[PDB]
């Protein structure tokens, strides 16, 4: 009841009082104001001029509670808009929080970890500014223990989450040397058994692999792909989501980097991923499939062997409409790279009729994707004479009507493929 | 050719999941 709902005016009167204990009470009252869930008055606290005082209290080494209270208060200002985070940074909080990482009070260090996570989380400029102030070495030193299990769960989760914000954004991506510094302890967190540490470690890896191939390689050469594939089969949705995002990012790289994903056994998880009831998992799993079917013929062959072509036929036949696109892409890239035997196998699995059904959509971009795929399929059946059988399939499922109704379309690409298709195979 | 996650999520996000960008502390 002592510090429950102070007015900002009372907080200001206490913080300006020349009594350190009065300032502590006012700072705790500020922290409780900033901790309530119904619209905490961050902007009023900023306008009263309290941030420099809070930042100054961070250095009060012989009053450890006012360090904690102002650290917590600043953490929650930094949790708001970019403008509010910037107010914390402009008060000089970054070097003061980094000095607090080494505190003998675990709860104070943890709070400095958290506040730096919020600042780094605002974006790449503050992320790189936290890095330039030297935050990475003291953060990583806090994880330099023989066994992470001796650390308190919340502490470890907070360190993992803040390291992942140092890995996060993309224009620009984090400094190469900082990524190299963090990765080894990140690999270690990826083997820790706590669902939240694992999820945030997968998020970090997902950020690091979202870029050019040299960035994927930094991660892939640390050996994490098998562990990512294991995490891909977790029952915790907060784990599979970033695990799948990372795997999907890695298979956007070279054929060789894609192959490590396949070597690691990832394709065996896809029967359940391509039927997963969370539509986002199923969308991203199908996108990931479309970058594997863009690979080599031996890689397309592995998709066949794992029985994933009926699963693509399934997603094409019935799924979220955005997911059906990814499946259309998966098919068209398959048709682009595959052998003739692999391509006619699509027809044997029933690809034709769900492709024709999707010609009824309005998104111009897929009529392209789809008509390309049937162009490639006709072209590969032609090398075995099976052009007629395919033309009657497309005719019997009402796909012929779609293809020819389509050369009155508002696109050069649509109706030159439409009308091309008709002359060699429908006359 | 392969489509990176930015081309992926160009015709998909907003709505694509990510970790927590910022975190408010409400309890001890």
Residue numbers in the entry:
A (entry chain C): 71 to 497
B (entry chain A): 13 to 40
Quote the original article.
GM130, a non-nuclear Golgi peripheral membrane protein, has been shown to bear an NLS-like sequence, allowing it to interact with Importin-α13. Since both Importin-α and p115 bind to the GM130 N-terminus and Importin-α pulldown by GM130 is enriched during mitosis, we hypothesize that binding of Importin-α to GM130 during mitosis may suppress the p115 and GM130 interaction, contributing to Golgi disassembly. Our data describe a molecular mechanism whereby Importin-α modulates mitotic Golgi morphology via a Ran pathway-independent interaction with GM130.
Moreover, crystal structures of Importin-α with recombinant GM130 either carrying a phosphomimetic residue or a phosphate moiety and molecular dynamic (MD) simulations show that the phosphate moiety indirectly enhances the affinity of Importin-α for GM130 by extending the intermolecular interaction network. Superimposition of GM130-NLS WT and the S25D and phospho-S25 peptides in complex with Importin-α revealed good structural overlay. Interestingly, apart from increased intermolecular interactions in the minor NLS-binding site, we identified intra-molecular interactions involving S25D and phosphoserine in the crystal structures: Asp-25 interacts with Gln-21 via water molecules, whereas the phosphoserine phosphate interacts with the Arg-18 and Gln-21 side-chains. Most likely due to different crystallographic packing environments, the GM130-NLS phospho-S25 complex lacked crystal contacts from symmetry-related molecules and displayed a relatively greater B-factor, particularly in the central α-helix. However, the highly dynamic α-helix shown in the GM130-NLS phospho-S25 complex indicates that the central α-helix contributes little to binding between Importin-α and GM130 compared to major and minor sites, and few hydrogen bonds are found between the central α-helix and Importin-α. When bound to Importin-α, the S25 phosphate enables water-mediated intramolecular interactions with backbone amides of nearby residues. Thus, S25 phosphorylation seems to destabilize the free peptide and stabilize the bound form, leading to a slightly higher binding affinity for Importin-α relative to that of the unphosphorylated GM130-NLS peptide. Moreover, the phosphate moiety on GM130 does not directly enhance the binding affinity between GM130 and Importin-α. Instead, our crystal structures of Importin-α in complex with either a phosphomimetic or phosphorylated GM130 peptide revealed increasing numbers of contacts with the minor NLS-binding site of Importin-α and additional intramolecular interactions within GM130.
